[PDB]
RNA sequence: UACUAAGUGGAAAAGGAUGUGAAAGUGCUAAAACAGCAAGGAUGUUGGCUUAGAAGCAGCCAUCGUUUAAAGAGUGCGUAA
RNA sequence: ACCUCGAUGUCGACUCAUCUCAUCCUCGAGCUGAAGCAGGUUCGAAGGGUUCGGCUGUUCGCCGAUUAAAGAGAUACGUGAGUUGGGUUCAAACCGUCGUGAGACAGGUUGGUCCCUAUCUAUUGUGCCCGUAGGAAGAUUGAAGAGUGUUGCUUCUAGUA
RNA sequence: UAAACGCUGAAAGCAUCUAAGUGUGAAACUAUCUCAAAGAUUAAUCUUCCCAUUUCGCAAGAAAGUAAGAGCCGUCAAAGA
């Protein structure tokens, strides 16, 4: 998991949900796991 | 939607009775029983053999909550009628599971012997010892048992060996 | 989310509870403070949270007193 | 939990040797029958307690209102009256003794006064260090350390509830966990108890059962010579 | 019991007269070794026809102290000078011979090479 | 009378986000909308230089045409290709 | 250049430490160009621990041998009514350099006085008086608290995965 | 409970750890371990013992008159300036 300031879809297949009032990216790529959005 | 979706059942064997906050749902298999919160905001109207769930208002929890239950119902009428079932391959070099009464022991790679206790109303068969079958009739229970099963040996992406579940495809990596 | 603070004369005595755990472990201490917080820094104020009863339960060693009943009070 | 207590006297220290080879340090504890006093109910009460009686004495020795409720409970007149947390299971009026509470060599630990020392500085009470002594040195040798926490109106300026200084030390009480009983005296009413115990010879001591290892019992045995008198 | 910065003697055929302590092997802080224990040493007085040149530094471990020890039986075993003797990683003896009498606590920690290169234990 | 769900109120930027409310336009939809599910998803050919090789998915020469509802010198993965 | 020149003692060392986390070790997890072992990065986490020496007044620094680790800072760059005075900075003397000179140099070197019986408050201990509503002698519950919390090696599991 | 991983599940027919419901999870937190603690004036609880006079008037009044216990003093040390 990458903790970045700015997350944004790398693939088409990254999916931005927000869970636990926290924006993070979600994908079949576990390299392009984001948070802290 | 799911909230104004039919829920057309048949009533040779299950019937739902709808008290205050407790609906209870009764068929082939074992009792299922849904609680209600308080404050619910979507009434249920019982016709014959056709379930319709209506809302008070557009709140935005009012709509999860028409969704959300309609999904239950749905998920506990067939539970009750047919039951969920859950299949998972345990796949490794000495890897291999049993089942002594209540308790499923698996040894895995560990030096401690590895037991898991059965809770109540799930019945977990293994006809082969790279196999094993979990049938319930509550779907969150038998997924809880999947999961804790799992949780000893998951997939590594190296080779195939952990309790993979049923056509569950990993990602591969070459470790040279 | 909000919580509870007491701090001790020594070097970290803070002790902090969270509202839910106020609400279950000591929900007595919780009302008598929240009812301290709103009196006047005063020699007399000692009295007046004196006269505070709070009890946990529905039972309570006050029924010789013949204590009227009054709503939202 | 089930907490099992017994109360004494230490007489002193020996040792014994045991099979596989051993010396152990024992320490001598006489314990009389003590009497159980007083039984009080988790229901009745709010907590769970058996109070004993022990140390027995003339009537003579007693005063009036103790005198009073030995003879209202029907109890033997003891100037000693003490109780343990949790212990339960025994009759009003039955005596006790170490025989039937705890086993030849299960665990258990021992509470009892520490020796007094007096007004003792800050080096023996807090294992500090001491200053320099050549090279020069000040009016302060056995210095307890700088006790400066912030020197300014931004910082504490003040010493630290709880500081390390000098003052009294001994006379307290201190519990010293897992001692293995050794050996059971029914003649002498005395029990062998491994490690040493503190305070003075002839204090009061309290044997109860281990909290951390309150069912382990480590067997131990003595050794029986073999010598033979002159050839 | 010796400690750091110690001379004490070595008891085998390497040309090692004196032999310096500088580390008591084993933890942080470590004060003293006893019997059995392992040290780094430097080689402070040699001989020419030696094994060691003088000035090395070494890993030895010790089989008699002045101060000595007390077992479990109760008996205290007590020398009148701290020795010891160069040993290899493997825990084998650099020398060929042990002079002098060595300790039994080296045979709790392995070291059977030294045991059965003794001439006799104590 | 509306708004906020953050104790925001009750301190902050570049940047990021299917939080929510209001408004103004535009596309399709009961001649069926969107998502999902079930099917097909092509031929010359694997075009040709080029590259050990690429030929639906290396750089190119570009960035073909028919059948047909649809199909791309392909959407990726991937195969030495 | 706002406080202090009717005086706020300034480097380093010793003793005692306390606090923060931007975490050195121990603890948990995600990704890996993670086969295993050993790593890299990020996230959570401050309970405890965080070595001894050679040279230098030294902080710093280089080097030696260990350790699980030898963390970054703040607290008047903590701490002289707690210690020392090696250094800086009095008077003495010399070297290099500047000055015609008396003298001068964050250039170098040798030597060279560190006071105070604690009033208040803070703190460590130990008492008298009074209150707790009759008095006294005993045994208790526990609101609010304090103390400790580190970790390594070997064997087996198993030369198994 | 933090990080992290979840199962069942919609808003947003798919998907989705979360919104309802139900879990797993660290030497951190609350207890379990040791010590002290009712001056905790919000001053707690239990047991035992001793008071329960004659007169005058003025009553948590007087003159005398009633006990448990404690202190002063002495010998001391399991204690201690
Ligand atoms: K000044
Ligand atoms: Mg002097
Ligand atoms: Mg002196
Ligand atoms: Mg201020
Ligand atoms: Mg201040
Ligand atoms: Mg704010
Ligand atoms: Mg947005
Ligand atoms: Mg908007
Ligand atoms: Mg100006
Ligand atoms: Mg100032
Ligand atoms: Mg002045
Ligand atoms: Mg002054
Ligand atoms: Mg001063
Ligand atoms: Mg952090
Ligand atoms: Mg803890
Ligand atoms: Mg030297
Ligand atoms: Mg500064
Ligand atoms: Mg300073
Ligand atoms: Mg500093
Ligand atoms: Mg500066
Ligand atoms: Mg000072
Ligand atoms: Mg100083
Ligand atoms: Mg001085
Ligand atoms: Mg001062
Ligand atoms: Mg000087
Ligand atoms: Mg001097
Ligand atoms: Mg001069
Ligand atoms: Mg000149
Ligand atoms: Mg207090
Ligand atoms: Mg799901
Ligand atoms: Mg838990
Ligand atoms: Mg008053
Ligand atoms: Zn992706």
Not at chain 4, 69 to 77: A, S
Request: with cysteine.
């Amino acid at each position: 998991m990458k903790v970045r300031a700015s997350v944004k879809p790398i693939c088409k297949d990254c999916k931005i949900i927000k869970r636990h009032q926290i924006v993070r990216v979600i994908c079949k790529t576990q390299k392009h796991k984001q948070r802290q959005g | 939607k799911i909230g104004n979706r039919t829920i057309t059942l048949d009533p040779a064997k299950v019937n739902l009775n709808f008290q205050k906050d407790h609906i209870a749902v009764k068929g082939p298999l074992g009792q299922i029983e849904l609680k209600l919160p308080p404050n619910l905001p979507l009434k249920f109207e019982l016709k014959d053999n056709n379930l319709q769930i209506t809302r008070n208002n557009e709140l935005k929890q009012s709509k999860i909550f028409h969704g959300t239950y309609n999904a239950l119902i749905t998920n506990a009428i067939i539970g009750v009628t047919q039951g969920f079932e859950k299949k998972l391959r345990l796949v490794g070099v000495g890897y291999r599971a049993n089942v002594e009464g209540e308790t499923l022991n698996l040894q895995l790679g560990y030096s401690h012997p590895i037991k898991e206790k059965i809770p109540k109303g799930l019945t977990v068969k293994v006809e082969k010892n790279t196999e094993i079958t979990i049938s319930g009739i509550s779907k969150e229970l038998v997924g809880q048992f999947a999961t804790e099963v799992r949780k000893w040996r998951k997939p590594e992406p190296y080779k195939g060996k952990g309790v993979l579940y049923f056509d569950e495809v990993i990602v591969r990596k070459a470790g040279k | 989310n909000e919580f509870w603070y007491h701090h001790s004369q020594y070097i970290g005595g803070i002790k902090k509870v969270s509202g839910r755990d106020m609400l279950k472990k000591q929900s007595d201490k919780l009302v008598y403070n929240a009812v301290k917080g709103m009196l006047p820094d005063n020699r007399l104020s000692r009295r007046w949270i004196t006269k505070v009863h709070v009890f946990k339960g529905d039972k309570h060693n006050m029924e010789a007193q013949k204590p009227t009943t009054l709503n939202w009070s | 939990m089930e907490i099992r207590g017994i109360f004494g006297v230490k007489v002193g220290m020996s040792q014994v040797f045991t099979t596989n080879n051993e010396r152990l340090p024992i320490t001598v504890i006489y314990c009389e029958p003590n009497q159980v006093a007083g039984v009080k109910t988790e229901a009745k009460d709010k907590y769970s307690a058996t109070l004993l009686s022990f140390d027995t004495v003339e009537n003579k020795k007693l005063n009036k209102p103790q005198q009073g409720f030995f003879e209202k409970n029907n109890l033997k007149p003891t100037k000693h009256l003490q109780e343990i947390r949790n212990m339960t299971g025994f009759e009003m009026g039955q005596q006790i003794t170490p025989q039937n509470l705890f086993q030849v060599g299960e665990y258990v630990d021992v509470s009892a006064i520490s020796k007094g020392r007096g007004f003792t500085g800050a080096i023996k009470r807090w294992n500090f260090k001491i200053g320099p002594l050549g090279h020069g040195a000040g009016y302060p040798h056995r210095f307890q350390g700088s006790v400066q926490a912030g020197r300014g109106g931004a910082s504490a300026q003040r010493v630290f509830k709880g500081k390390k200084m000098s003052g009294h030390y001994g006379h307290e009480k201190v519990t010293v966990q897992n001692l293995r009983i050794v050996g059971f005296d029914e003649a002498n009413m005395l029990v062998l108890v491994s490690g040493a115990i503190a305070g003075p010879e002839g204090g009061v001591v309290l044997i109860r059962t281990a909290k951390k290892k309150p069912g382990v019992v480590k067997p131990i045995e003595l050794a029986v010579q073999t010598e033979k008198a002159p050839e | 019991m010796v400690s750091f910065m110690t001379r004490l003697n070595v008891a085998d055929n390497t040309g090692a007269k004196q032999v310096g302590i500088i580390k008591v092997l084993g933890s942080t802080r470590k004060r003293y070794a006893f019997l059995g224990d392992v040290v780094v040493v430097s080689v402070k007085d040699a001989i020419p026809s030696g094994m060691v040149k003088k000035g090395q530094v070494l890993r030895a471990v010790i089989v008699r102290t002045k101060k000595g020890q007390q077992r479990k039986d109760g008996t205290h075993l007590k020398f009148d000078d701290n020795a010891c003797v160069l040993i290899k990683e493997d825990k084998s003896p650099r020398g060929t011979r042990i002079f002098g009498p060595v300790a039994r606590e080296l045979r709790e920690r392995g070291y059977n090479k030294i045991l059965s290169l003794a001439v006799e234990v104590v």
